[PDB]
Amino acid sequence: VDKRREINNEHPLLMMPLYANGEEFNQGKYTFWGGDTLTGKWENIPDDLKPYTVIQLHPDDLPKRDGAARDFYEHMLEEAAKYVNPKTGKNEPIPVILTVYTAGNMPYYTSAHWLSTSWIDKMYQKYPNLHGIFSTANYWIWANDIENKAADYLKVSAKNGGYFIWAEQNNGSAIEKAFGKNGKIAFQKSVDKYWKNLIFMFKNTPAAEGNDSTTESYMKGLWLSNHTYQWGGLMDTWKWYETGKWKLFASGNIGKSQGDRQWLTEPESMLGEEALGVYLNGGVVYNFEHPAYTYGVNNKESLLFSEVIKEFFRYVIAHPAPSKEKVLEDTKVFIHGDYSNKGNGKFFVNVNTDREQTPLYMTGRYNVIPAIPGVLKTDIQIKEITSPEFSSTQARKEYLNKLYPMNYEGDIFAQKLDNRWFVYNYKVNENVKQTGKLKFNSLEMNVEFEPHTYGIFERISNGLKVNLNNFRTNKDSLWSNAQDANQAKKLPQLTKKGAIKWIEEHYIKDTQFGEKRVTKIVLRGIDKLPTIHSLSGTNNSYDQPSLNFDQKNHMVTITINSNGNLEFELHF
Ligand SMILES: CC(=O)N[C@@H]1[C@@H](O[C@@H]2O[C@@H](C)[C@@H](O)[C@@H](O)[C@@H]2O)[C@H](O[C@@H]2O[C@H](CO)[C@H](O)[C@H](O[C@H]3O[C@H](CO)[C@H](O)[C@H](O)[C@H]3NC(C)=O)[C@H]2O[C@@H]2O[C@@H](C)[C@@H](O)[C@@H](O)[C@@H]2O)[C@@H](CO)O[C@H]1O
Known part of the structure; x- marks a missing residue:
């Protein structure tokens, strides 16, 4: 045992x-x-x-x-x-x-x-x-x-x-x-x-x-x-x-x-x-x-x-x-039923995936909606897959949108856990940049990502900790x-x-190695030029990030040119 x-x-x-x-x-x-x-x-x-x-x-x-x-x-x-x-x-x-x-x-x-x-x-x-x-x-x-x-x-x-x-x-x-x-x-x-x-x-x-x-x-x-x-x-x-x-x-x-x-x-x-x-x-x-x-x-x-x-x-x-306890707390909808009877992977297309053939998500708004098969007993709203709410793409979003509020802006994947925003560009084999706007209380952050790029942005006592990965x-x-x-x-x-x-x-x-490519991070509601600390990443894979501070507009644009993993803190 x-x-x-x-x-x-x-x-x-x-x-x-x-x-x-x-x-x-x-x-x-x-x-x-x-x-x-x-x-x-x-x-x-x-x-x-x-x-x-x-x-x-x-x-x-x-x-x-x-x-x-x-x-x-x-x-x-x-x-x-x-x-x-x-x-x-x-x-x-x-x-x-x-x-x-x-x-x-x-x-x-x-x-x-x-x-x-x-x-x-x-x-x-x-x-x-x-x-x-x-x-x-x-x-x-x-x-x-x-x-x-x-x-x-x-x-x-x-x-x-x-x-x-x-x-x-x-x-x-x-x-x-x-x-x-x-x-x-x-x-x-x-x-x-x-x-x-x-x-x-x-x-x-x-x-x-x-x-x-x-x-x-x-x-x-x-x-x-x-x-x-x-x-x-x-x-x-x-x-x-x-x-x-x-x-x-x-x-x-x-x-x-x-x-x-x-x-x-x-x-x-x-x-x-x-x-x-x-x-x-x-x-x-x-x-x-x-x-x-x-x-x-x-x-x-x-x-x-x-x-x-x-x-x-x-x-x-x-x-x-x-933890299970924390995922269970955050779950607003739990589906009971067989996806095989509702079009399988099609169930989520244009709800939180952009196409049938992808392992990625297009929004973190609902994170991953949990389900068990109809054969299992039960044993948060527990909803039968045959509910009117799930009959169509639009029904799905309307119902989900009442229980899961929009918590960021922009056509890009993002999900928040505690003080951390996790972001990625969801394109699979199409060369399209994506942008989003994320908030940590009063701090507003915009990002622009090329495909095959994810970042983790953590609000810390004196700024922001950034881990980026676009290695390709x-x-x-x-x-x-x-x-x-x-x-x-x-x-x-x-x-x-x-x-x-x-x-x-x-x-x-x-x-x-791939070409270095540009990621942009824009901070709004900012008083002073932030400073970069603890910069490291894949050997020979990044330029020193460039900052442009617009004092009047309380904003700073950080431009990164890289192809690898990267981490740093911004203090402000
Ligand atoms: C009808 C048929 O031939 N079966 C396909 C599956 O794989 C084949 O059959 C099994 C019995 C093995 O003999 C396997 O070697 C065959 O390729 C498919 O499963 C995986 O499919 C991918 C294609 O998507 C590959 O074939 C993969 O296997 C290859 O790569 C792994 C490493 O990732 C190994 O190197 C294998 O030797 C290599 N095979 C060949 C011929 O080069 C398949 O994965 C392997 O097999 C599966 C069943 C599982 O045991 C895995 O752990 C293992 O890696 C399946 C995909 O949907 O399609 C079937 O039609």
């Missing part, structure tokens, strides 16, 4: 995936795609982050036959268990999560098919450093006994004080079915008993189907109604492939034709905009794909990891996400030689091996 680790707002969790190389396994070698090693990867994790990071082993393309995944996993669990801090000579077992269920555990899709619950129990009993087990990405192959197996995984985890972590997306009603929509109620009953050992996450890979907002809505509602211990999200740069995009801002769709160029192209900073929707809504668990771009290769951090993910995750440790390297080189979508589509494949090699040779080193 005693939990093997804490997972909550004060103890968030960053999953650190390591994918087995099946080809090398057949040759009797135990290696991961991308050249990370279990020991090397752990060692390279910053020490301040080690208490909040867990290695997630994934069986990837291990042989699809009995014994392959057990063999590889036992080998790795041994390595984790016997690790010695280099250093202090102490045996310090590396915490691990095993991926045990994926692709419906179909024998034609995954070696994970041949990991029995009996075997998992044995592993939990042998390895105290095994902290949880992971199911991921079954929406597209919703196997006959998936709910029965999920109940078994939750129970075996609870039996051992571990966590069952499930990353899933509401495609084909997956989240609704999980809890009993179609009559498979084993997991519903398991959760009644064992929800304290459950973590539920979204998995935003299938971006063409547009279920980001409804899945995240459920994740948050399930948490608030005690149907999961904590929640979070797996954010996946493959969304760029799923939606058929190519060169940044280029016109034309290439569909699903250049996978390995496409998962490299999502702007680095956009992952932080996605991760804000988790943080701002009380979520505390984070995971990413494709691992080579989002984390790195060869036991080294990629620039996406170092400049965006690591900074962001350090931020949510230093400033714990809002230039990916055009991947799309060289293609003057349009037709030509792009016909490029020679980068391939998986080729994309790992591109990261090694052109991203880890010889990086094509």
